[PDB]
User: Fold spectrin alpha chain from Gallus gallus.
Amino acid sequence: DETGKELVLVLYDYQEKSPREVTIKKGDILTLLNSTNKDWWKIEVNDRQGFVPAAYLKKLD
Assistant:
């Protein structure tokens, strides 16, 4: 994790809305840190970790 193993493809741009969210760019390949919640997954982008919509990411496997 925390940069390595499970990766995800960002399907659409996403602008953070809550203090626990992060902003992601469409077309980015990022580390999937936690996919236990159906609607909200934690990922890493740059030097940040936070949630974004699960539907806005595709799991790469």
